[PDB]
Amino acid sequence: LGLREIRIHLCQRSPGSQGVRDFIEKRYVELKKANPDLPILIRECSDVQPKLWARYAFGQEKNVSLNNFSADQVTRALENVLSSKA
Amino acid sequence: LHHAVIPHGKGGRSSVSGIVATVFGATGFLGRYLVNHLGRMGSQVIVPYRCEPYDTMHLRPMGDLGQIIFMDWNGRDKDSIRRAVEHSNVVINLVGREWETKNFDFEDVFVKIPQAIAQVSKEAGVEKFIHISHLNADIKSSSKYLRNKAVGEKEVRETFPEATIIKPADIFGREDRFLNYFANIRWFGGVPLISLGKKTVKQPVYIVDVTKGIINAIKDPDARGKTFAFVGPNRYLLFDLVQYVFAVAHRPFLPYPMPHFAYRWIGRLFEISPFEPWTTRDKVERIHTTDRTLPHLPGLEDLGVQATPLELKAIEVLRRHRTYRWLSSEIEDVQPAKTV
Amino acid sequence: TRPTVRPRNDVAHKQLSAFGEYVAEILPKYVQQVQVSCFSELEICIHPDGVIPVLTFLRDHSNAQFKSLADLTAVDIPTRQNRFEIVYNLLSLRFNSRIRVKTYTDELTPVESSVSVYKAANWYEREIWDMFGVFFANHPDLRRILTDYGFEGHPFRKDFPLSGYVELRYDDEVKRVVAEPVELAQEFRKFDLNSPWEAFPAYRQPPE
Amino acid sequence: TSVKPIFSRDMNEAKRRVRELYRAWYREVPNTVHLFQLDISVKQGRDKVREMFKKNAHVTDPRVVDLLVIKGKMELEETINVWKQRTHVMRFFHETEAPRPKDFLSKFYVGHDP
Amino acid sequence: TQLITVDEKLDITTLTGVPEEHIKTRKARIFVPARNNMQSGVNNTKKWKMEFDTRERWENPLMGWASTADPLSNLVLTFSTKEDAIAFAEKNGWSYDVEERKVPKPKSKSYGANFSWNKRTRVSTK
Amino acid sequence: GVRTSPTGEKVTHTGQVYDDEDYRRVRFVGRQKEVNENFAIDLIAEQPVSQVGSRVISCDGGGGALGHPRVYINLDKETKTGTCGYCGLQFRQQH
Amino acid sequence: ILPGAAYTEKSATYVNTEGRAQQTKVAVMPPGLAREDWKIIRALSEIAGMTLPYDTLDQVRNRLEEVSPNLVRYDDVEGANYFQQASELSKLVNQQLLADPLVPPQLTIKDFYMTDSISRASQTMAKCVKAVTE
C-alpha cells in the first residue's frame, strides 16, 4: 500500500559503494527533509555489495542491487522507490 | 502443572513423557502392549497386580529404572485402588475375563470393579480415565459378557463423566484368544460354526492399533468424554475369516454346521473345568455375534491411528500353529478372505 | 638419579640407530623417517606404497629376520589430512629385537594388505577395517570382526562418540531385540583435566 | 587432486558396481524373507533396499561409492550366510521408533532440537 | 598411471555412519579455548578445539541425574591449526563457526614506573 | 533431629522432601523412605567448645593418620569460636 | 505469558555499545516448557497464518543480515562515518534544554546491583544491596 522504510547498505572502502557514498555526502539531508517520518537506514559494513531495500506495507520488500552505480543512478533508483509505493 | 511432570527429552526409554498411568489389569493381553508402548516413551507406569509377581516378570524390561511401580491391589478393596490411583494423572481400566470364575462373575469384573476404579479415581483427583468396553455391548444381548459390559459402560459414564470409553471389535495379536481360538479347533474336530458362520460379520482390529489408540487418547485433550469405536479396516464374514485363519496355518479346513441348541452344550462341557476353560457358552455367543456398525462414534482414524488389516499381521499371529512341512511359507502365499 | 629413574641402555640405542641407517639406505624408495626413542625403540616411518616391499624385506633379509608380527594397529589423529596411522610391530626372534614400521592413510585411500607377508595380519587389518574404516586391498576375507552385524560407523575413530548412536533393548511388541537412538539416564561426565602449566620443556613445540 | 582409486577409475565402473550390487540384493530379498521367516512382503523388503540405495544417491566421488559397494557386499554376505538374525534384518525397518516431529510446529511443541 | 583425477568435494558423510540428525542439524564450533582466569598458565590455549552445541540435559526421575539424548555432547576434538579443523568439519558435513585466536597483546612493563616523579602510575604502597 | 512434612514424609538432613502434588512419592507407596536419623549438623552442636591456652591450635580430628589433615586454627577473635574445616570441632582461647 | 529463554539458554546475537555484534552460546537449555524467543514468535506466525520466511537459526541470521549486514560479522567493529549529515540534521529543530541538572539515576553503589529483571530476581544482589545500605 505504501513505502514504510528504506535500507541502504554500503561499504566504507569498496569502490562499488563509492557513488553510493557520494549519495550520502551530497544528497541525503534534503532527502531526510523530504520525508522526515520515513526511516532511511544507512548500514555500512565490511565487504558488502551496495543494496537498496524497500519495505512496503504488509511486509513486502523490494530489492535493488546498487553495485557500481554513480550518485545520479542511486538518486534515480531511490526516487523510483519513493515514487512507486507498490 | 508440576515441575517433575513436564515432558522432557526426545521420547525415548529414559525420557520423561509426563504421563503417570495406573494401568489396572496390565498383566493381560492389552496391558502387555500398553505398558510396552508407555514405557518406551519414558512414562511412570503404575501396575497394580493381582497375580503372582512371576506373572508380572515380562512387564519389567518394558521401561527405564523406577518407571514401572508394581503394587498389590484387590478389586473388592477400595483401599488398594486409592493407594494406586492417588498419584497418577491417567488411569486405564483393562480388567476382564472371558469366563466367570468361582468368586468373580461378569458383574464383579465389568460392573462392580470398573465403577469402583472410576469412583475412586474421581474422588482422588485423576483427570483422565480410560475404560475399555466391547463393540457389541448391549443391554438385550444374548451373552452375559456384553450385557454386564454395557451396564459397566453406563456406570463408568455416569460416575466419571469425562472418561474415554473405547469400543474394540475383536482384538487380534500374538497372545489373543481370537485367532488362536480359531486356530485351536483343529484339535477338537472340524471347526463347528453356527449356520456355517455366514450370518455373522466381523471386523477385527489389530492390538498395536488399539494400543496407539489408547495412547493417542491419553495425549488428546479432545478425547475427554468421547466414546471411541476401534475397528479394523475390513469387515469379514465369520466363515471366510476362519477359512483365512486355517489357510494361513495350512491346516485342513473342513467346516460343518452345528445348531444353536447343541453348540451351547459343547460350551457347558468345557466350562466345568476349574482351570481357565477352553471355551464357554458365552464365547459361543460372542464368536457368533456380528460386529455392529456404529458410524456416529469416532474411531482410530480420528485419533490418527491407521488401522492395520488382517492380511499383514495374520502371518505374525498364525505362524505358531503351522507344522514344519509348511512352517516357512510366506505372507503372500495365501489368497485373502472375502470382505463385505 | 639412581633409584627412581629408569636406566638408559645406550648400546641398544646405538645398535638400533645403526640398523635404522641400514634400513634407510637399503630402502630409500619408501622410507621417510627413521627415529630411535629415548628408551631405545626403533621406528621406520614409510610411505603406504611400500607396505609389501619393506615388510617382505624385514621378514626375509638375513640381517633383519623379523619373522613375528606382534601387533598391527591404526591410530586416528584427525588434525592430519591422512588421519590414520597404521603401525606394524615386528619381532625378530633371531636378533632378539623389535621394530616399528609406521605408515599413513585417510578414509579413502586403500592400504595394500600385508597378508602376503605375515598371515597374522589376516584378522588385524580386518579389525582396522572394523574399527577405523581403512580399506585393505587384496585381503582374503575382509569383513567386520568386533562390532555388531548391522553396525553403521567406525568405533575407534575419534569423531565417533563414546556411547554410539544406537542402543539395544528387548521389545515385547515385536518380540525382538531392537535398536533405538541412545539416551543415557546419566550423561558421561566429561572432565577437563589438562593443567595450564607446561610439564615437559623438552617436548615444547615452537610457536607460529 | 591426484588420488589413488579403490576399484573404480571413474563414475562409470562405479555405477556398474552399484548396479550389480542392486541386482544381487534384488535377487537376495525373497530368500531373506523366506529363511529368516520375516513377516514382511517381498515387495516391502525390495522397497527397503531401494530406499537404502536412494539414500546414498547424491555422492559424486568414485572412492566413496566404491566403499559403499564394499560395505553393501559385506552386508549382503552377512545376509546370504545366516550371520544376521531376524533382529539385524528388521533393524532396517525402524518399527519400534515413533514418527519424529517433521514440521516446525510439532518440533516446537515437543522440545528444543532444530 | 595408477592414480585417478577426482576434482569432487571431499565428503564422507555417507561413510561415517552418523545419522542425519547429527550431520545437518548440528553446529560445530571451532575455537581456541580461552584461558581459565582462575589460573595464569597458557598451555591450554595452544591448540584448536572443535565442540558442538549443547543439547538438552534433563533430570532423571529416579535419581535426579543429568539424563541426555545427545551422543555428540562430550565430543571435543583437538586440532593443530584452524584450517585443519575447517577441513575436518567440511569433510564430515558439519556446519561450523570459527572464532579467531585471541592472543594477549604485548605489554610495556616497568618496575621503575611504580615510583615516578610526576606521573599517576606511582603505586600508593608496595 | 529428623522432622516430618505435612504429607507424612520424613525430611532428610539436606532438606529434601517430595511435595504433596509430586507423583514421585509413588515409589514409597507400600515401602519406606530410607533416611538417616543421625544428623551430623545436630550432633556437632553437642560437642563442647575446647578451651585452650594457646593462640594457634591444631586439629587432625584424632587418630593422627586416621583422621583428617592437620590444620592450624587461629583463635584471635574473642567474638567467634575457631571451627575446624573438616571435623567441625570448635575451639576457643579461654582468656 | 509466553515463557522465553535467557541469555545462557540460547544462541543469540547481542550488540554492545560500540556496534560490535556478538553471539551467546547455549550453556543450558531453558527450564520447563519455556522455549527460545524467536522460536515462539515463528510458531505464533505459523498459527496466525502469516508465516515468517525462516525455519532455523541460520535463516534468522540471514534475515538479520538482510536488515543490517553487520549483525552477522562477529567481533568486528564496523566504522560509521557521516557525522556531518547528522550534525546538519540536528540543527533543524531548536529543541530547548530543561532547567533541571544532569543527574544519572545511579549515584552510589546501592543503585548498581538491581537494574534488569535478572538482577532484581537475585538473592546475591539483594545481599549486596542490604550490605551497602547498612
Ligand SMILES: NC(=O)C1=CN([C@@H]2O[C@H](COP(=O)(O)OP(=O)(O)OC[C@H]3O[C@@H](n4cnc5c(N)ncnc54)[C@H](OP(=O)(O)O)[C@@H]3O)[C@@H](O)[C@H]2O)C=CC1
Ligand atoms: N479380544 C479381547 O480380549 C477384547 C478385550 N476387551 C476388553 O479389554 C480388556 C482387557 O482384555 P484382555 O487383555 O484381552 O483380557 P485378559 O483376561 O487377558 O486380561 C485381563 C487383565 O485383568 C486382570 N484381571 C482379570 N480378572 C480380574 C479380576 N477379577 N480381578 C482383578 N484383576 C483381574 C488380569 O490379571 P490376572 O493375572 O490377575 O488375572 C489381566 O491383567 C477387558 O476389559 C476386555 O473386556 C475388549 C475387546 C476385545
Ligand SMILES: [Zn+2]
Ligand atoms: Zn579437625
